[PDB]
PDB file of C-alpha atoms and ligand atoms in Angstrom:
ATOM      1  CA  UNK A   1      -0.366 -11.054  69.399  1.00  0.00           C
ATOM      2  CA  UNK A   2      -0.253 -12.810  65.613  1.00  0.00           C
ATOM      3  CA  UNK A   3       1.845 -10.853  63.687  1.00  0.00           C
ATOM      4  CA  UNK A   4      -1.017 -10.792  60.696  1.00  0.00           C
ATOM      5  CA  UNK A   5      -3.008  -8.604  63.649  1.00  0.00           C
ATOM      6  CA  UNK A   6      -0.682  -6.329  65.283  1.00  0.00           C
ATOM      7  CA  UNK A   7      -0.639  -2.343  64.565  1.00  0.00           C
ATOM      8  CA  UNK A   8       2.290  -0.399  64.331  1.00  0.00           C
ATOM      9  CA  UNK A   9       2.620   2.706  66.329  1.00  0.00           C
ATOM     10  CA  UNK A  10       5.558   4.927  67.792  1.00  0.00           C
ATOM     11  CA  UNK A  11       6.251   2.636  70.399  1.00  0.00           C
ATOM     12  CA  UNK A  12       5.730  -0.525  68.430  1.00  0.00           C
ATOM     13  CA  UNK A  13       6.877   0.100  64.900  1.00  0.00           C
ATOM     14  CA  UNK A  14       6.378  -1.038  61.465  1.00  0.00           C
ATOM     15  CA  UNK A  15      10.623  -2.763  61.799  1.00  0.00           C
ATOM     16  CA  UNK A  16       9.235  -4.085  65.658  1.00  0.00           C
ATOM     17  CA  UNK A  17       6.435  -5.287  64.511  1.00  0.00           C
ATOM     18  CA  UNK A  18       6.813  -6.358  61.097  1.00  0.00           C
ATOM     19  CA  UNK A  19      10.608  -6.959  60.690  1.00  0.00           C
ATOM     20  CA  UNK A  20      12.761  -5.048  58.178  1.00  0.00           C
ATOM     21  CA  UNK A  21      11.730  -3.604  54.679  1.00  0.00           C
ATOM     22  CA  UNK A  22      13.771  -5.088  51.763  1.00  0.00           C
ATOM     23  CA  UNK A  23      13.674  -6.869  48.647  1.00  0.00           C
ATOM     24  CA  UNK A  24      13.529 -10.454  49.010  1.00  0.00           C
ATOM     25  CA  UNK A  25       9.983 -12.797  48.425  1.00  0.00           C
ATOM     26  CA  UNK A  26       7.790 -12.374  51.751  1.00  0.00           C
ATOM     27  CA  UNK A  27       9.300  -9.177  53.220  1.00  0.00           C
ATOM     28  CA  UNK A  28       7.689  -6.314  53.217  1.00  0.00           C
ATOM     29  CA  UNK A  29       8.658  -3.569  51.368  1.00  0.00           C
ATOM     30  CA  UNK A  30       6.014  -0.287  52.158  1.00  0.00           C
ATOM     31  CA  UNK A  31       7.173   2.495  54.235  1.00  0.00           C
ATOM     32  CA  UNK A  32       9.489   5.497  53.926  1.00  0.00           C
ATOM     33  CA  UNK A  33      11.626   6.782  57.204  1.00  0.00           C
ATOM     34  CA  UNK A  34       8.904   8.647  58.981  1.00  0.00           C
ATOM     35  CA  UNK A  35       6.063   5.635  58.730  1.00  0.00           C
ATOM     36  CA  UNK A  36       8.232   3.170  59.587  1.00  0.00           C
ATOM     37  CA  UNK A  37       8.965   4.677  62.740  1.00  0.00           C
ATOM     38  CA  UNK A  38       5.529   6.392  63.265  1.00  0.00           C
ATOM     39  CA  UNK A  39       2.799   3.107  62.086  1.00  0.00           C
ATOM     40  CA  UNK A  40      -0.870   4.065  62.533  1.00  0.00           C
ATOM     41  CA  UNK A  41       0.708   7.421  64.110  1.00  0.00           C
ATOM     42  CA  UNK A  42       1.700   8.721  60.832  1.00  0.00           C
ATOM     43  CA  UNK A  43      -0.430  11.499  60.269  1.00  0.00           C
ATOM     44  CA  UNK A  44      -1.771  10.078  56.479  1.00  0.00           C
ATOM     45  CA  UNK A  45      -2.440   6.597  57.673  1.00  0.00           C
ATOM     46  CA  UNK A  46      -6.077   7.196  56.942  1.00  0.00           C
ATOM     47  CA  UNK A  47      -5.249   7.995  53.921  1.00  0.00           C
ATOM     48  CA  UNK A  48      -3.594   4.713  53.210  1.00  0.00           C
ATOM     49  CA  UNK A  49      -5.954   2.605  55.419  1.00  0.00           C
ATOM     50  CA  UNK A  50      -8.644   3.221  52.705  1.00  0.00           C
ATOM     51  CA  UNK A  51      -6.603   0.867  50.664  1.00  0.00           C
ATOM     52  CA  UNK A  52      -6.637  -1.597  52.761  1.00  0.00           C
ATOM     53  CA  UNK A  53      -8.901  -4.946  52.627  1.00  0.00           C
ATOM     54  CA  UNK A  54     -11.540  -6.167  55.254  1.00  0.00           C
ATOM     55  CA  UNK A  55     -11.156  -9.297  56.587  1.00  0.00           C
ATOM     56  CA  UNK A  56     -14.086 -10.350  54.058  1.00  0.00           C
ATOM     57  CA  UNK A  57     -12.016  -8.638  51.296  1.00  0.00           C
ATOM     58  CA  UNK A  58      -8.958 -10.072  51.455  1.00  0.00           C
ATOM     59  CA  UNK A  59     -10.394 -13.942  51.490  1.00  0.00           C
ATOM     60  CA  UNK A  60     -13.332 -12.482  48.620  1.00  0.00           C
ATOM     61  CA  UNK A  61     -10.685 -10.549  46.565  1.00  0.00           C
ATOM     62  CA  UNK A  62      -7.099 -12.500  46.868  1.00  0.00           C
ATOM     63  CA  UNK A  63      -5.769 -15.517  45.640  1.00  0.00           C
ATOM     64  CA  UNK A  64      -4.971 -17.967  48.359  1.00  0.00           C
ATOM     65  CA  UNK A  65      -2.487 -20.523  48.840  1.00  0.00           C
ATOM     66  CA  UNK A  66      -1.265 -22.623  51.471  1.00  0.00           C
ATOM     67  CA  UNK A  67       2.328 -24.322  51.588  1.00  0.00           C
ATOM     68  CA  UNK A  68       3.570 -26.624  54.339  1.00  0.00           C
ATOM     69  CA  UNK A  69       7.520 -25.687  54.323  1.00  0.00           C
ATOM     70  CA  UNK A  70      10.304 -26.631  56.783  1.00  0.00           C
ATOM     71  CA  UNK A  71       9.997 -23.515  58.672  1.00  0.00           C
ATOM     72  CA  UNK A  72       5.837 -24.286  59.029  1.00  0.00           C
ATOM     73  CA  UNK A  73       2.247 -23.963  57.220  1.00  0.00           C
ATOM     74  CA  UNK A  74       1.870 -20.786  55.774  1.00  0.00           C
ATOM     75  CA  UNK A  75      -1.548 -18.911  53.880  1.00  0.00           C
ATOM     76  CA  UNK A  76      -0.255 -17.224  50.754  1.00  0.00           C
ATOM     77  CA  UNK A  77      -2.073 -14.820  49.071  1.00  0.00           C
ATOM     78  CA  UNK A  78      -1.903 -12.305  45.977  1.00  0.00           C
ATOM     79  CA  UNK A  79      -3.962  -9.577  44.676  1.00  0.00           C
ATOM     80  CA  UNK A  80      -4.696  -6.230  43.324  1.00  0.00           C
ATOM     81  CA  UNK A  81      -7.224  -3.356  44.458  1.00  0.00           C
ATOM     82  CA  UNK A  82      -8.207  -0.934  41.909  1.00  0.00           C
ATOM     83  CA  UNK A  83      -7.734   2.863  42.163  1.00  0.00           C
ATOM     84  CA  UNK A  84     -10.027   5.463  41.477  1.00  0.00           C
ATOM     85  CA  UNK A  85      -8.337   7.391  38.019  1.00  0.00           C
ATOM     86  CA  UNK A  86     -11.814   9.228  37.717  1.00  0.00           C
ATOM     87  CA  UNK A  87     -11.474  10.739  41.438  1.00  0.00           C
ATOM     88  CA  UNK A  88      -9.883  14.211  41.836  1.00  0.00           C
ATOM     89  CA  UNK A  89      -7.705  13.149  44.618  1.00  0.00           C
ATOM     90  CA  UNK A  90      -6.184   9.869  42.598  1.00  0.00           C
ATOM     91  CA  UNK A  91      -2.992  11.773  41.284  1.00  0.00           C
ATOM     92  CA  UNK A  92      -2.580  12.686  45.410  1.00  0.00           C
ATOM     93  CA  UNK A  93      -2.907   9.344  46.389  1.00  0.00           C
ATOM     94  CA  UNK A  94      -0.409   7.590  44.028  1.00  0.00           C
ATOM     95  CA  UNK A  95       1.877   9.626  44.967  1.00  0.00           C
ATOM     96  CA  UNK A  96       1.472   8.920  48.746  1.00  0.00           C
ATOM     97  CA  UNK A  97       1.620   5.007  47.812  1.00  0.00           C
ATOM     98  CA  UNK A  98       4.724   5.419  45.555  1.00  0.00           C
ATOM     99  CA  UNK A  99       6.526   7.359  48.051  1.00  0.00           C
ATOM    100  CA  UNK A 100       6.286   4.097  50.315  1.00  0.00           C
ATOM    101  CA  UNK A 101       6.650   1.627  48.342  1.00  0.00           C
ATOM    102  CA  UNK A 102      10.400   0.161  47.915  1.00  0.00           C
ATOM    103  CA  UNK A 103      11.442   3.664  49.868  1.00  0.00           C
ATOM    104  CA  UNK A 104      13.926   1.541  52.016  1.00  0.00           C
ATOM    105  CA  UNK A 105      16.071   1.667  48.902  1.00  0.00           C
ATOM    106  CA  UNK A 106      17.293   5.615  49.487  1.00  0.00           C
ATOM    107  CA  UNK A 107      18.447   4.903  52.990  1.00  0.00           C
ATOM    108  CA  UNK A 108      20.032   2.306  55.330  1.00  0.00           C
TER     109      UNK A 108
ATOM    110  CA  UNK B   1     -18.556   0.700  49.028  1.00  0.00           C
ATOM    111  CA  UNK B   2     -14.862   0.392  47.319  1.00  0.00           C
ATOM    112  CA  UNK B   3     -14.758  -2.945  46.658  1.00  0.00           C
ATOM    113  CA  UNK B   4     -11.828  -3.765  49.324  1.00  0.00           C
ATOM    114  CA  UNK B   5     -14.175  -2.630  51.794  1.00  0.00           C
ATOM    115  CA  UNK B   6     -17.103  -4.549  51.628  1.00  0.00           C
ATOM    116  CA  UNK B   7     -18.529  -7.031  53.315  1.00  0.00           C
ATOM    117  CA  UNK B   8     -20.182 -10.402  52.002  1.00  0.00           C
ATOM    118  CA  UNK B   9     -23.473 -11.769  53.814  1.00  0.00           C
ATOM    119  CA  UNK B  10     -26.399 -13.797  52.880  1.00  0.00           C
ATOM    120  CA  UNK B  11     -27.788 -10.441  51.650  1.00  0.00           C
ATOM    121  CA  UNK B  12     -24.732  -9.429  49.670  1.00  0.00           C
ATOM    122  CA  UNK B  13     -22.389 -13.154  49.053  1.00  0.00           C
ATOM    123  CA  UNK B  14     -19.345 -13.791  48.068  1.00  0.00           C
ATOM    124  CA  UNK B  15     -20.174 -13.173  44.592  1.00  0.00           C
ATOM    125  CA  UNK B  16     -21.970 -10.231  44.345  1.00  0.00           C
ATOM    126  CA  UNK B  17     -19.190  -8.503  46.197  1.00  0.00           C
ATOM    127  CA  UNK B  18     -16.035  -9.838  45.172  1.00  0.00           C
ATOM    128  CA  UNK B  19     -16.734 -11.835  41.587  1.00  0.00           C
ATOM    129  CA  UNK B  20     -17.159 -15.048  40.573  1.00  0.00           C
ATOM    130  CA  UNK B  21     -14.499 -17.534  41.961  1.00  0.00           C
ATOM    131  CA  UNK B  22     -12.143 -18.691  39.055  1.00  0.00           C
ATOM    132  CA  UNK B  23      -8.529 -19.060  37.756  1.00  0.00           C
ATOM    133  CA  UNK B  24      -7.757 -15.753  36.515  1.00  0.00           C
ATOM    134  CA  UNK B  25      -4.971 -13.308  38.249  1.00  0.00           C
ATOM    135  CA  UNK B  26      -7.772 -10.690  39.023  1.00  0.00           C
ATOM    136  CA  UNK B  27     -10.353 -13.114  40.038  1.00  0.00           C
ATOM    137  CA  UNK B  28     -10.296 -14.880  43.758  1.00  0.00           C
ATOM    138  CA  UNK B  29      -9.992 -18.819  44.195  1.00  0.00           C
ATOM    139  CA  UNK B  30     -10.963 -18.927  47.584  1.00  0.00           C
ATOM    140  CA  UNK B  31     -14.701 -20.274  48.894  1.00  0.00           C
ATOM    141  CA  UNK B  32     -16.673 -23.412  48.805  1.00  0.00           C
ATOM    142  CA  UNK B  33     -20.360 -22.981  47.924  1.00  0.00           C
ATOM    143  CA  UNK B  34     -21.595 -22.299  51.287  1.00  0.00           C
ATOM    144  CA  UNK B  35     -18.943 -19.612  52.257  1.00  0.00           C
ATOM    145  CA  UNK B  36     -19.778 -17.931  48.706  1.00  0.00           C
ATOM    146  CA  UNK B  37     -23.369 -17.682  49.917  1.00  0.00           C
ATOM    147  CA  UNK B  38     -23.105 -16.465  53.249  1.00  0.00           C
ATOM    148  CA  UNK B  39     -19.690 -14.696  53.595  1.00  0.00           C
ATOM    149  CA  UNK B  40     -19.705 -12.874  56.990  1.00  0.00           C
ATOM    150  CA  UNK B  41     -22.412 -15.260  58.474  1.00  0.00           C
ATOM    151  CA  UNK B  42     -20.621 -18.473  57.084  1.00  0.00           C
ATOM    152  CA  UNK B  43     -20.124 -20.952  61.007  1.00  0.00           C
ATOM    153  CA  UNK B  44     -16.514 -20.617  60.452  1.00  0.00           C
ATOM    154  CA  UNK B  45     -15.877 -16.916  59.220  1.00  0.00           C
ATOM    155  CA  UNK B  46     -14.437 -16.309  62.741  1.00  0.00           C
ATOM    156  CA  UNK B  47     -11.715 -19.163  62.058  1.00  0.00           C
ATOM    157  CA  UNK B  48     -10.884 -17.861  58.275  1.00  0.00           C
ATOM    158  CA  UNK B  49     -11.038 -13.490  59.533  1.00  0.00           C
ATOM    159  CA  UNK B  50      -7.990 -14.826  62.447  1.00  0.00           C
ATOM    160  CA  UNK B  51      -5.614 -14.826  59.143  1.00  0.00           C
ATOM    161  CA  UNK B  52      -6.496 -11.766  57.370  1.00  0.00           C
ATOM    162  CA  UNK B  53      -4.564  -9.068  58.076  1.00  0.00           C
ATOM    163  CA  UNK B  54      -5.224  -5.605  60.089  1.00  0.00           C
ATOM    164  CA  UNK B  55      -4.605  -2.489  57.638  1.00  0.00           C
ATOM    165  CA  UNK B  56      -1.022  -1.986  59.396  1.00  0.00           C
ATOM    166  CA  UNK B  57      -0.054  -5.496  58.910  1.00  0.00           C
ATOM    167  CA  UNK B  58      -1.543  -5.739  55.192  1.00  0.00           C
ATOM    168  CA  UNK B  59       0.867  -2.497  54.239  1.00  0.00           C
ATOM    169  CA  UNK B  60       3.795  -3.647  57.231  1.00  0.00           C
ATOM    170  CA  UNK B  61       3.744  -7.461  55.834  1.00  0.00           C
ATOM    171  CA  UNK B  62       3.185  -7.384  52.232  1.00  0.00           C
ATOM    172  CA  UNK B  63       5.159  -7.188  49.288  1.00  0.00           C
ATOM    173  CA  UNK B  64       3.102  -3.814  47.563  1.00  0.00           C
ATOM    174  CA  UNK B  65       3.589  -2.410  44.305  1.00  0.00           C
ATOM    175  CA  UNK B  66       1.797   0.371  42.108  1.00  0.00           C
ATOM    176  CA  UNK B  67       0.561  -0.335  38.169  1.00  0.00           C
ATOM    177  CA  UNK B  68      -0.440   2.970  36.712  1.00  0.00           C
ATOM    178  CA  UNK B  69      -0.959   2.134  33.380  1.00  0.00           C
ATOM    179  CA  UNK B  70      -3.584   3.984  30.368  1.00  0.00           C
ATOM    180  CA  UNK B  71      -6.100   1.435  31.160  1.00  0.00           C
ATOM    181  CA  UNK B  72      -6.249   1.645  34.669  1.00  0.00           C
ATOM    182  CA  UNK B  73      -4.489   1.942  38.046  1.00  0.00           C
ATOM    183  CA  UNK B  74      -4.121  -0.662  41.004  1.00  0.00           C
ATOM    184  CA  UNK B  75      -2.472  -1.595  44.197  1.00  0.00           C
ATOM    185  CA  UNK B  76      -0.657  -4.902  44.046  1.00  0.00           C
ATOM    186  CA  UNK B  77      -0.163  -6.858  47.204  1.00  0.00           C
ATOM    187  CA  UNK B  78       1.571 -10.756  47.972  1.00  0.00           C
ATOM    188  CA  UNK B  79       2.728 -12.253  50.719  1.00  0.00           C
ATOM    189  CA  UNK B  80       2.455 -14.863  53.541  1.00  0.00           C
ATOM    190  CA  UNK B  81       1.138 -15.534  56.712  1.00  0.00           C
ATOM    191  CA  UNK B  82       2.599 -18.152  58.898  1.00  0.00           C
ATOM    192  CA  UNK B  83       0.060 -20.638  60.797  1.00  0.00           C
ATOM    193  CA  UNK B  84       0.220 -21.115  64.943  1.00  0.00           C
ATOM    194  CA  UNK B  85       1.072 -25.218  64.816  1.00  0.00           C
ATOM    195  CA  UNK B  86       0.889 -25.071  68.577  1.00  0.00           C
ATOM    196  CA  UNK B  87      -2.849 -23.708  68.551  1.00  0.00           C
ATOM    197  CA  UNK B  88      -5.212 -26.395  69.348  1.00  0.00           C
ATOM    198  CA  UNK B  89      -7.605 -26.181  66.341  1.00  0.00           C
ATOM    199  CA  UNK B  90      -4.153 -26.270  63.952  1.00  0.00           C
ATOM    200  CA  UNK B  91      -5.386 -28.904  62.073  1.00  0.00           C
ATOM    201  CA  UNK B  92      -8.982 -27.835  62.168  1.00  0.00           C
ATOM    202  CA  UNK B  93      -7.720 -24.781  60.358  1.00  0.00           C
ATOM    203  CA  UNK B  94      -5.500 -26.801  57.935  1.00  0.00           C
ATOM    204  CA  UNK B  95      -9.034 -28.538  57.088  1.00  0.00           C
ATOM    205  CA  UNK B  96     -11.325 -25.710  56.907  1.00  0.00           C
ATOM    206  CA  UNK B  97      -8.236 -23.807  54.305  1.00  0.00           C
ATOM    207  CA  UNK B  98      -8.364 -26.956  51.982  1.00  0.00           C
ATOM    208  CA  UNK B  99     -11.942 -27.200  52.114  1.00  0.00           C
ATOM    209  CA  UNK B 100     -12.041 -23.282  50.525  1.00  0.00           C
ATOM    210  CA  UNK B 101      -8.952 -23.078  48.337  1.00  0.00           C
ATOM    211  CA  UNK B 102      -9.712 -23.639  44.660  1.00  0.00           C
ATOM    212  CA  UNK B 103     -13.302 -25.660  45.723  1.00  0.00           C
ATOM    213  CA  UNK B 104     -14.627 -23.717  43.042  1.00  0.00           C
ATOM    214  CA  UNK B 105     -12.924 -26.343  40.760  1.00  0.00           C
ATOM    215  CA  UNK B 106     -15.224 -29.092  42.467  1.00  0.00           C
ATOM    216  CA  UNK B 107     -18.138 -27.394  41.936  1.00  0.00           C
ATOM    217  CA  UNK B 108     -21.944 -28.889  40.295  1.00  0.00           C
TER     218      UNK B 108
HETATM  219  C1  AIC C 201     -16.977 -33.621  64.928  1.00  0.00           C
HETATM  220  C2  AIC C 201     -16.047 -32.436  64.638  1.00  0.00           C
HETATM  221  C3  AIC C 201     -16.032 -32.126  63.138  1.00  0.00           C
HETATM  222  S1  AIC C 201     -16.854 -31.005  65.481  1.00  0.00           S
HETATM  223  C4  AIC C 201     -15.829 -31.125  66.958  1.00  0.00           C
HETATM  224  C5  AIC C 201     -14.744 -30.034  67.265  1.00  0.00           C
HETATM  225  N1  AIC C 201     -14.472 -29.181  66.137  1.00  0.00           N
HETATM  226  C6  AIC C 201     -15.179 -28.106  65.766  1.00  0.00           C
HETATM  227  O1  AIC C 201     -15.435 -27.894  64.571  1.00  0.00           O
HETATM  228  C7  AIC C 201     -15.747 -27.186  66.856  1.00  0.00           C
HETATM  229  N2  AIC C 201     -16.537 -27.795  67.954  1.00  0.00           N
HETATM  230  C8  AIC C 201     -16.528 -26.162  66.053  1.00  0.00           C
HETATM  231  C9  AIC C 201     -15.983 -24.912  65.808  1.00  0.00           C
HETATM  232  C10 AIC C 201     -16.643 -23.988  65.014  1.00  0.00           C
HETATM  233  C11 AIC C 201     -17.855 -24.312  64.453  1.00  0.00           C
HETATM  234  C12 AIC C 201     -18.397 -25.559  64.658  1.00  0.00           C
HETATM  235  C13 AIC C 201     -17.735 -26.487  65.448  1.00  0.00           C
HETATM  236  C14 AIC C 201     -13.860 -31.279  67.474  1.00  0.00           C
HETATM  237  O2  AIC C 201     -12.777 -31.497  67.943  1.00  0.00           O
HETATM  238  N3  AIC C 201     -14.707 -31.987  66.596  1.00  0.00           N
HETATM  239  C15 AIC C 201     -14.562 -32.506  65.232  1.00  0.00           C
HETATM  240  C16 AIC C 201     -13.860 -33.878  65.130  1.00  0.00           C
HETATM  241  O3  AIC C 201     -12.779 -34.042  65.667  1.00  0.00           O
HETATM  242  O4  AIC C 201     -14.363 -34.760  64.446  1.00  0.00           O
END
């Protein structure tokens, strides 16, 4: 399965499936101890998952690129997806993000 | 619909969902005039959708970050998706890419 289409999950996790978190250009850095070893099992993934794009969002919304390198061809991309301030819940969900984002740093 | 969940058709294009196509950081470069109109229902959508990522992948793969700021709040995301050169359509794909990134530049 292309890695761009795999789910993590308990027995396929976000390090299996998705290689370690840490700093440098293209790897990724989202996920504290318990999602990276839980995926789509974590028990708040929907509550991430709302973040993310369709497959019609992420080509509508992102900036695309495409480089041919020595290691292949590869479809870059960058964007943003606004939050909710107004919603009751937004204080709630920034905190969920932040707590995954760059989390690898606290631990080995 | 949150805006990273939508999804462009003839009856709601690239446009209306996403933005105009241009070269600002917030706006999307990606769509020739045909895709823009149609989204969902363009011939090739299937061929583009195969490198957009799955919600586990898009938060497994991607470099994410967090701007809270006065003005507003949003979910960064970059990263890169390697190509399959031993698929059979490779350089089908490699066409159809070019023929979407940045056409907006081309455009009547
Ligand atoms: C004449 C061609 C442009 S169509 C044919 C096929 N490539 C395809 O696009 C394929 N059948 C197809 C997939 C999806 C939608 C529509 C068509 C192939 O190979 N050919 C090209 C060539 O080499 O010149």
């Amino acid at each position: 399965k292309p890695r761009q289409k795999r789910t993590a999950t308990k027995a396929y996790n976000v390090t299996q499936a998705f290689g370690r978190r840490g700093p440098e250009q293209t790897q990724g850095n989202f996920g504290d101890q318990e999602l990276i070893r839980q995926g789509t099992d974590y028990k708040h993934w929907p509550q991430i998952a709302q973040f993310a794009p369709s497959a019609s969002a992420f080509f509508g919304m992102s900036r695309i690129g495409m480089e041919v390198t020595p290691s292949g061809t590869w479809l870059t991309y960058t964007g943003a997806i606004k939050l909710d301030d107004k919603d009751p819940n937004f204080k709630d969900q920034v905190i969920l993000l932040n707590k995954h984002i760059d989390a690898y740093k606290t631990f080995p």
